[PDB]
Amino acid sequence: IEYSLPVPFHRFYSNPTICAALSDDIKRYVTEFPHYHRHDGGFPLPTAF
Amino acid sequence: AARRIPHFYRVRREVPRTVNEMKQDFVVTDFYKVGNITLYTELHPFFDF
Amino acid sequence: RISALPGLNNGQLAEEPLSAYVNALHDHRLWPPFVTHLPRNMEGVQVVA
Amino acid sequence: AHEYHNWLRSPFSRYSATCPNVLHSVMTLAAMLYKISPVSLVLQTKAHI
């Protein structure tokens, strides 16, 4: 966990569960907005991607 | 980008839903009804607006 | 997966997600008959002993 | 003994008393928990359920 960084970069590879497990900021984000937890590509990617 | 990814989710603000994504949740029959807001963008089969 | 409506529940209309309005399983006010830990969020819920 | 203020009333146990011990009975018990708020109703209709 300490050496791992999550990279949600594609609508096929952005699983919010893994990112929330690996990153605390993403965990807080998903906690605030539970509807983003879904897996249909509706999870917001960073503005760059 | 990889390091900045946590910083994006650091701020707990939701993002607007893109129009192309909004089209996907109409069923085959009510896509043509007046309730389909997005119809004003569906001008060409081969192109997006 | 059956309980929610994944095709249409992408949004909010209060602090709660859309999935909470459609089915009682996703509503946080409904508690399971047996508990071991208190829920994270209890906005409108008050517990009396 | 406060049936009327409870969430699950008599028909739930009446159904469970005789349902076959199959996955579909679990699925139907989940489906019976759909809420009947106006938001739930518009979501259900838009899915053509």
Swiss-Prot record, chain C:
Superkingdom of this protein's organism: Viruses
Q: Where in the cell is it found?
A: Virion; Host nucleus
Q: Give the multimer and partner information.
A: Homomultimer. Makes the hexons and eleven out of twelve pentons. Interacts with triplex proteins 1/TRX1 and 2/TRX2; adjacent capsomers are linked together in groups of three by triplexes, heterotrimeric complexes composed of one molecule of TRX1 and two molecules of TRX2. Interacts with scaffold protein; this interaction allows efficient MCP transport to the host nucleus. Interacts with capsid vertex component 2/CVC2. Interacts with the small capsomere-interacting protein/SCP.
Please report which protein family the annotation says this sequence is part of. Answer: Belongs to the herpesviridae major capsid protein family.
Question: Could you tell me what this protein does?
Answer: Self-assembles to form an icosahedral capsid with a T=16 symmetry, about 200 nm in diameter, and consisting of 150 hexons and 12 pentons (total of 162 capsomers). Hexons form the edges and faces of the capsid and are each composed of six MCP molecules. In contrast, one penton is found at each of the 12 vertices. Eleven of the pentons are MCP pentamers, while the last vertex is occupied by the portal complex.
> By what name is this protein known?
Major capsid protein
* Source organism phylogeny: Viruses, Duplodnaviria, Heunggongvirae, Peploviricota, Herviviricetes
Placed within the complete protein, the shown segment runs: 686 to 734 of 1370
Swiss-Prot record, chain D:
Q: Which domain of life is it from?
A: Viruses
Q: What are the cysteine partners in each disulfide bond? A: none
User: What range does the record give for the signal peptide?
Assistant: none
Where can this protein be found? Virion; Host nucleus
Subunit info here reads: Homomultimer. Makes the hexons and eleven out of twelve pentons. Interacts with triplex proteins 1/TRX1 and 2/TRX2; adjacent capsomers are linked together in groups of three by triplexes, heterotrimeric complexes composed of one molecule of TRX1 and two molecules of TRX2. Interacts with scaffold protein; this interaction allows efficient MCP transport to the host nucleus. Interacts with capsid vertex component 2/CVC2. Interacts with the small capsomere-interacting protein/SCP.
- To which protein family does this belong? Belongs to the herpesviridae major capsid protein family.
Role description:
Self-assembles to form an icosahedral capsid with a T=16 symmetry, about 200 nm in diameter, and consisting of 150 hexons and 12 pentons (total of 162 capsomers). Hexons form the edges and faces of the capsid and are each composed of six MCP molecules. In contrast, one penton is found at each of the 12 vertices. Eleven of the pentons are MCP pentamers, while the last vertex is occupied by the portal complex.
Q: What is this protein called?
A: Major capsid protein
The stretch of the full-length protein covered here is: 980 to 1028 of 1370
